[PDB]
Amino acid sequence: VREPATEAEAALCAVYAEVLGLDKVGADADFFALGGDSVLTLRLVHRARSAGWEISARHVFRHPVVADLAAVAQPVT
């Protein structure tokens, strides 16, 4: 399983695992391949912000892989 290589990747890995109910998730994990849907996307957006990273639901649907999602995130102001 692929370790995160940036702070944003590491935060999103942890949030993916928490939202999807998994123990740990790799930096190459696909949110919808792992069981994501509209409800869980909503939760991912909220919990990512709590972890310091601003994303949208549209970001998740367009970039469901952790590493790709981390690249469009913005740090919370």
Match 């994303």 to its residue by tokens. 55
The CA distance from 32 to 49, in Å, is: 19
CB contact at 8 A, 49 and 26: no
The CA distance from 18 to 27, in Å, is: 14
Resolution (A): 2.3
The CA distance from 11 to 35, in Å, is: 19
Report CA torsion sign: 51, 18, 72, 58.
negative
* Total number of domains constituting the chain: 1
Q: How was this structure determined?
A: X-ray
Note down the domain range covering 56.
1-77
CB contact at 8 A, 34 and 13: no
Give the residue among 13, 8, 5 at the shortest CA–CA distance from 53. 8
| Phi-psi group of 2: left, alpha or beta (phi > 0 → left; psi -120 to 50 → alpha; rest → beta) | beta
The CA distance from 17 to 74, in Å, is: 20
The CA distance from 66 to 44, in Å, is: 11
